Subunit: 87 residues, 2 copies
């Protein structure tokens, strides 16, 4: 079980999987996730993904609790930090 | 659906709408919300707005879960950071 983040719409392009945790921009980059890059994601059942517009879990927050082929026009290519929960 | 913050009592004066997220003072300013300015707000049903006296989600916290024509004497013109939840 992991959250997989995808570069392109409908789970296309480059992908990176992450376990639960609170990942800053620098930490995302080390995990090979660039800024302003995420477009779709797969979320395990029962899990929560809080996607933040700015670093350090600030700015607009978009929340996903299931597989999402398109994050929305506002959220597209905006992720700079993320909190992942298995609850 | 958005939280709309208003300059004056009873939803008067300048207004700015924000999606869920954790907004610092600088982020509020970029969204055109000055410090010590907010007097009333509209909150979508089921949402929570935590209004903080100081930057970075510290100091006194005032909580609103419905449309509020007057934030209260203590809370008036004090917002410097805010957390908005759709839950
Ligand atoms: Ca993309
Ligand atoms: Ca005011």
């Amino acid at each position: 079980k992991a959250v997989t983040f995808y570069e392109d719409i409908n789970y296309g392009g480059a992908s990176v999987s992450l376990q639960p945790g609170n990942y800053t921009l620098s930490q995302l980059n080390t995990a090979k996730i660039p800024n302003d890059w995420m477009t779709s994601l797969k979320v395990p059942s029962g899990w929560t993904v809080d996607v933040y517009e700015n670093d350090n879990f600030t700015g607009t927050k978009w929340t996903y609790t299931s597989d999402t082929p398109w994050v929305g026009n506002d959220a597209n290519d905006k992720m700079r930090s993320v909190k992942i929960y298995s609850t």
